[model samples]
Target chain A: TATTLFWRPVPVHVKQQDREDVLEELTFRILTGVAKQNHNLRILRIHISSDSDLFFLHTLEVSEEDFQSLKNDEDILVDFASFPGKIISLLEKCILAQPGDSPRFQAVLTIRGGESVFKIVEINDFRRLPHITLAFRPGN
Target chain B: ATTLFWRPVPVHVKQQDREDVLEELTFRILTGVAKQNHNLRILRIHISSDSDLFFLHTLEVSEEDFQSLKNDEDILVDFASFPGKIISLLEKCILAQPGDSPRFQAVLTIRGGESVFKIVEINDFRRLPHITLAFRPGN
Candidate 1:
């Protein structure tokens, strides 16, 4: 069992053409930044999906306590804007996950997830208006 | 009878903690910037054990005529260092290959017909060398 699940409403201005690139950049930025900041945040699995109103940022890790602190700031969220800005925001959010985290080493987002989430972004909007689902699975 | 075979190289780089960050940076840069710069030459593929060098840059193509040019370039022996300032030099070298080519695109190398080639960086010399092998099947 996990501690808490976080959800975010999808922005309306996001264009169909730019969704995949934006989502991929966000996923990489989040996973790598978290791994770099908190040693205890051993990322296990990440699944991102979107329908219409909401985009899910599902992430699984070994420590439930570490994950809980990330939800502390209700306003902090992944920026789907530009690449550099997105990266900066990712590092900030992950670092904010746990205060007093190390500042020595920079983070690297390795092990890119599949393009299944991208496929969700490609189809017609009429077929896509439910809610974006992002899930994290902390395995045994 | 017809058959097809293809295997992708899974990139794995093991380094000290001090090295992982830099290595990851390089990979990310390659995927983003370098890939966009068409005909950005690979410096060289060297085999340390044999003290041999295969200096070449691949020109990938899908068009039949372009593939012919690549095949022709591959069969030649002359090795000329690719002119530097490639981001601008490769103006026409980055077009998408025609959909009909075997690999969709080709790497037009300086040296051709040899079975293998390896490329290593100066900093990576202390570690194992990169290796690439080529083969053609007969029906």
Candidate 2:
């Protein structure tokens, strides 16, 4: 069986300046949903981020059989609704401590796996934030 | 430029009892609409099998260029919203002609599109068919 992925970039149109906080709240809700479901499945990694403008979400599901080769190179990047605190912390570190340069908000995601590692970018929009989904079934 | 194609299928749970008929209607509506909006975009193809079942509708939009293929196809079957005729026919075919076979019924809608296509099966049983809205944008 194949793992199917879905991505949608819903644009949030703004008419005023106060809407930025609304956007943040909306993005936060989406991310929260992503964080809870990310680890339950055979996921390689999921990532989500924002850059003052748009949001991006992505998901990746892996088969249990392929977990070994995945561990060698575990650098996976994807878009998702929410990120784990560790990933969020890294995103904070990556953005806030970027020495002697223009500081901007950034987000990053990472996953640990020994047998399977995967990265996928489902939605790519500078406007809408990422919302990731991953699901799998045991082999027959 | 993103052109999303939308193809609707009628699969109301009640219509599961009328699969053949809903399938026919879906075929007809898709063909009919394609005739006018030659540049039609098919973003999704959904079959609402049961209004209560809440199944995920199938989505089939693959890039913007596929819109060109819309004109090359014709409807494989015929379906219409001639309620007076369809109801009369269904009465004879489904109500009167008893068997294990599902019945075919027409649902009237404001226009034909994903929304109507997905929901027609539900509305058809109620007999308050509206017009189709698939022909124009923002309808």
Candidate 3:
């Protein structure tokens, strides 16, 4: 058995009434299109914003052991600005990417226990720190 | 002059178009909360499970309307959605009273033109269930 899931922040221009359908389609495409390769992937995190103005740090309710592992990792505090170019290259292929735009979208894929977590972050000139952080755990 | 805005409903379309619209709405609302957009007010949503016959109705009642009916003995049960759940969520978000100092207050006031909608009071509270989504001017 396999479980797959995807999430992204709704664009500002979209009206609230149409959010559900829009979210559904985006998630479906990402899961079937780009994410199809990683059959064993379990978790994905997508960060879709770079504007520091709308920054908030929130955590998902994962298991106590997993939480402790994350808490102990010093690298977790790493600067988002320093993300590798390879991750950015992958983001360019996804729908959220702004190909030629100055403020580019970036993503990171991590595989853990038959789970693949994708962390997407936005890179802009003004943003020194990451904005709009996201976490997804598809399977138990 | 002030602008009055209402959220849109999802429509069937090519998968891409639908995804774009939903993300845009989510961004707007979250950004509105972060930047405290005064124009963004009144968020209403209907939730239902495929198997369950009961529906969960939610509304984000702006502060202005909440104060307008302060003097009345009964809460204004307006809108087609269940007002009971809305009030319950609001209660959870807001402070118990002005005197309580230890806890942070979640209530927020929207500053702009008044809401232009019919206010109806449904006397049958037991039949309808409701909830309210909470928002503040700035995070």
Candidate 4:
């Protein structure tokens, strides 16, 4: 019932010792950079016990027809309705604002269908891998 | 009972005491990262959070200020602005729950120094499972 936009996996390397900082920076920077740019972008990292690949997931609002030709290049489309139980875990669980709450700096989000909408915008890399850039849109 | 290095920081009675913990945890982390990486000369970085309220922002400083910070100078005294002190914000999570217990579970929290702030901040007090920070290594 949604469009799954996949970007060709870019080669990324992060030592086991460095994974925590790398992932934390990637998540925070991505969200902060695309703040007003894509409010609906609720990005999360997925871990697959079967693979070392780090997958970023978002609930984008783009139409399937809109990106029909993207597959010809580097993108791929696959329905994840049955997103594997085989996967170990998903990182990042956000909380929403509560009543009587005084407004603060933290971002409060309501996860849609157990996922978030993110628009991948910029992928700035450092002297190493695991660097990323993503954006999001409303209703997304 | 007993406290572990990874236990949810015990709640303190006074605002000043908590503030001390706030600064202590934050510095410990910056120090931890700096200690591991020689001359960990970072002019800027993403000061991120992972607990109750998720937030992240880029913290940039001049090379001179950066050097001073590496030497243990001007952190919260004049480092950056936020809605509240890092620990003050985290206390909300512990306070939300009742009774004097270890409140939240331990996290391998301090690994990369990015999420360490959150583990102690305890937004999730119970910090969110996943939060990320991405940036280049230098200017």
> Among these predicted structures, which one has the highest DockQ?
1
Model 1 - which docking category?
Answer: incorrect
Cα lDDT tens digits, model 1, A32-56, are 2235555645342333334432443
Candidate 2 per-residue lDDT, tens place, A31-69, comes to 222223444434333333234545333333343333334
Fraction of true contacts kept, per model?
A: 0.00, 0.00, 0.00, 0.00
Cand. 4 TM to true fold? 0.22
User: Between 1 and 3, whose lDDT is larger?
Assistant: 3
Candidate 4 per-residue lDDT, tens place, A1-140, comes to: 12222222222212232233122122221111112334544323221111342453333322233224432231233322221111111112112223344431122122234443222111111011111112232222
DockQ of each: 0.02, 0.01, 0.01, 0.01
lDDT of 4 at A64: 31
Docking class of 4: incorrect
How well does each candidate superpose onto the true structure, as a TM-score? Answer: 0.21, 0.18, 0.19, 0.22
TM-score of candidate 2 to 2 decimals: 0.18
Report how large a share of the reference interface contacts model 1 reproduces.
Answer: 0.00
> What's the C-alpha lDDT at position B107 in model 3?
20
List lDDT for all candidates, in order: 0.25, 0.28, 0.30, 0.26
Better of 1 and 3 by TM-score: 1
What's model 3's overall lDDT? 0.30
